Amino acid sequence: KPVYLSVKADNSMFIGNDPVTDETMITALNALTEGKKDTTIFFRADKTVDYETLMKVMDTLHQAGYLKIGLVG
Amino acid sequence: EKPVYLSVKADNSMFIGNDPVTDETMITALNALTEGKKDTTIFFRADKTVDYETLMKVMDTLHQAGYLKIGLVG
Amino acid sequence: QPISVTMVT
Protein backbone atom coordinates (compact mmCIF):
# COMPACT_ATOMS: atom_id res chain seq x y z
CA LYS A 1 0.00 0.00 0.00
CA PRO A 2 1.25 3.49 -0.89
CA VAL A 3 2.48 5.67 1.95
CA TYR A 4 1.47 9.33 2.23
CA LEU A 5 4.15 11.67 3.60
CA SER A 6 2.72 15.06 4.60
CA VAL A 7 4.63 18.27 5.40
CA LYS A 8 2.74 21.11 7.07
CA ALA A 9 3.43 24.83 6.79
CA ASP A 10 5.27 24.89 10.14
CA ASN A 11 7.43 22.08 8.64
CA SER A 12 5.99 19.39 10.93
CA MET A 13 5.98 16.04 9.15
CA PHE A 14 3.75 12.95 9.07
CA ILE A 15 3.82 9.42 7.69
CA GLY A 16 0.15 8.64 7.39
CA ASN A 17 -1.12 10.10 10.66
CA ASP A 18 2.15 9.46 12.53
CA PRO A 19 4.38 12.46 13.38
CA VAL A 20 7.99 12.08 12.24
CA THR A 21 11.19 14.11 12.10
CA ASP A 22 14.20 13.77 9.84
CA GLU A 23 15.81 11.49 12.43
CA THR A 24 12.80 9.16 12.88
CA MET A 25 11.21 9.12 9.39
CA ILE A 26 12.96 6.04 7.98
CA THR A 27 12.23 3.90 11.05
CA ALA A 28 8.57 4.95 10.90
CA LEU A 29 8.40 4.30 7.16
CA ASN A 30 9.99 0.86 7.53
CA ALA A 31 7.25 -0.14 9.97
CA LEU A 32 4.66 0.50 7.24
CA THR A 33 6.64 -0.88 4.29
CA GLU A 34 8.32 -3.78 6.14
CA GLY A 35 11.41 -2.61 4.26
CA LYS A 36 9.92 -2.93 0.77
CA LYS A 37 11.76 -0.12 -1.01
CA ASP A 38 9.51 -0.47 -4.09
CA THR A 39 6.64 0.93 -2.01
CA THR A 40 5.13 4.04 -3.58
CA ILE A 41 5.61 7.22 -1.48
CA PHE A 42 3.23 10.11 -2.19
CA PHE A 43 4.46 13.48 -0.96
CA ARG A 44 1.92 16.15 0.03
CA ALA A 45 2.67 19.57 1.44
CA ASP A 46 0.96 22.80 2.26
CA LYS A 47 1.41 25.47 -0.39
CA THR A 48 3.97 27.50 1.57
CA VAL A 49 6.38 24.60 2.24
CA ASP A 50 9.66 25.58 0.63
CA TYR A 51 11.95 23.78 -1.78
CA GLU A 52 14.74 23.40 0.78
CA THR A 53 12.36 21.49 3.05
CA LEU A 54 11.03 19.34 0.20
CA MET A 55 14.52 18.38 -0.92
CA LYS A 56 15.63 17.59 2.64
CA VAL A 57 12.76 15.10 2.88
CA MET A 58 13.44 13.79 -0.63
CA ASP A 59 17.12 13.25 0.21
CA THR A 60 16.36 11.31 3.39
CA LEU A 61 14.10 8.96 1.45
CA HIS A 62 16.56 8.75 -1.45
CA GLN A 63 19.55 7.79 0.72
CA ALA A 64 17.41 5.07 2.35
CA GLY A 65 16.58 3.59 -1.05
CA TYR A 66 12.99 4.85 -1.35
CA LEU A 67 12.97 5.92 -5.00
CA LYS A 68 9.31 5.49 -6.07
CA ILE A 69 8.15 9.05 -5.35
CA GLY A 70 5.04 10.87 -6.53
CA LEU A 71 4.38 14.54 -5.78
CA VAL A 72 0.71 15.25 -5.02
CA GLY A 73 -0.67 18.72 -5.75
CA GLU B 1 18.16 14.84 -26.29
CA LYS B 2 20.32 17.17 -24.21
CA PRO B 3 18.58 17.65 -20.84
CA VAL B 4 16.84 20.96 -20.18
CA TYR B 5 17.36 22.89 -16.95
CA LEU B 6 14.32 24.78 -15.67
CA SER B 7 15.20 27.24 -12.89
CA VAL B 8 12.82 29.06 -10.53
CA LYS B 9 14.10 32.14 -8.68
CA ALA B 10 13.16 33.24 -5.18
CA ASP B 11 10.98 36.00 -6.70
CA ASN B 12 9.27 33.23 -8.76
CA SER B 13 10.83 34.32 -12.04
CA MET B 14 11.47 31.31 -14.25
CA PHE B 15 14.03 30.24 -16.85
CA ILE B 16 14.46 27.48 -19.44
CA GLY B 17 18.23 27.31 -19.57
CA ASN B 18 19.02 31.03 -19.84
CA ASP B 19 15.68 31.98 -21.43
CA PRO B 20 13.16 33.83 -19.21
CA VAL B 21 9.76 32.13 -19.37
CA THR B 22 6.30 32.49 -17.84
CA ASP B 23 3.56 29.92 -17.34
CA GLU B 24 2.07 31.07 -20.66
CA THR B 25 5.31 30.83 -22.67
CA MET B 26 7.11 27.88 -21.00
CA ILE B 27 5.96 25.11 -23.33
CA THR B 28 6.68 27.05 -26.53
CA ALA B 29 10.16 27.88 -25.24
CA LEU B 30 10.75 24.28 -24.18
CA ASN B 31 9.58 22.90 -27.52
CA ALA B 32 12.24 24.99 -29.30
CA LEU B 33 14.95 23.16 -27.36
CA THR B 34 13.37 19.70 -27.37
CA GLU B 35 11.93 19.85 -30.91
CA GLY B 36 8.84 18.29 -29.33
CA LYS B 37 10.73 15.29 -27.95
CA LYS B 38 8.71 14.56 -24.80
CA ASP B 39 11.29 11.98 -23.64
CA THR B 40 13.78 14.80 -23.04
CA THR B 41 14.93 14.91 -19.43
CA ILE B 42 13.89 18.09 -17.58
CA PHE B 43 15.89 19.03 -14.49
CA PHE B 44 14.17 21.38 -12.06
CA ARG B 45 16.20 23.67 -9.81
CA ALA B 46 14.91 26.34 -7.49
CA ASP B 47 15.93 28.80 -4.83
CA LYS B 48 15.52 27.40 -1.31
CA THR B 49 12.54 29.65 -0.58
CA VAL B 50 10.47 28.68 -3.64
CA ASP B 51 7.25 27.23 -2.34
CA TYR B 52 5.44 24.01 -3.10
CA GLU B 53 2.54 25.82 -4.78
CA THR B 54 4.97 27.33 -7.29
CA LEU B 55 6.83 24.04 -7.84
CA MET B 56 3.61 22.19 -8.46
CA LYS B 57 2.25 24.80 -10.89
CA VAL B 58 5.41 24.37 -12.98
CA MET B 59 5.20 20.58 -12.65
CA ASP B 60 1.57 20.63 -13.81
CA THR B 61 2.32 22.75 -16.88
CA LEU B 62 5.05 20.31 -17.92
CA HIS B 63 2.85 17.30 -17.09
CA GLN B 64 -0.14 18.46 -19.15
CA ALA B 65 2.19 19.07 -22.12
CA GLY B 66 3.48 15.50 -21.87
CA TYR B 67 6.88 16.23 -20.31
CA LEU B 68 7.09 13.39 -17.80
CA LYS B 69 10.84 12.76 -17.38
CA ILE B 70 11.51 15.10 -14.46
CA GLY B 71 14.45 15.21 -12.07
CA LEU B 72 14.56 17.51 -9.05
CA VAL B 73 17.99 19.03 -8.37
CA GLY B 74 18.90 20.06 -4.82
CA GLN C 1 -2.53 13.83 -10.13
CA PRO C 2 0.93 12.53 -9.01
CA ILE C 3 4.12 13.76 -10.66
CA SER C 4 6.85 11.11 -10.59
CA VAL C 5 10.25 12.60 -9.84
CA THR C 6 13.84 11.46 -9.68
CA MET C 7 16.19 13.33 -7.41
CA VAL C 8 19.60 13.89 -9.04
CA THR C 9 22.86 15.10 -7.48
Author numbering:
A (entry chain B): 62 to 134
B (entry chain A): 61 to 134
C (entry chain C): 43 to 51
Quote the study's own text.
Active nutrient uptake is fundamental for survival and pathogenicity of Gram-negative bacteria, which operate a multi-protein Ton system to transport essential nutrients like metals and vitamins. One of the key systems involved in this transport is the Ton system, which forms a multi-protein complex embedded in the inner membrane. This system utilizes the proton motive force (PMF) to physically open a variety of outer membrane transporters – the so-called TonB-dependent transporters (TBDTs) – and, hereby, realizes active transport by means of the inner membrane proton channel-forming complex ExbB-ExbD and the periplasm crossing protein TonB. Here, we study the periplasmic domain of ExbD, a crucial component of the proton channel of the Ton system. We show that this domain is a dynamic dimer switching between two conformations representing the proton channel’s open and closed states.
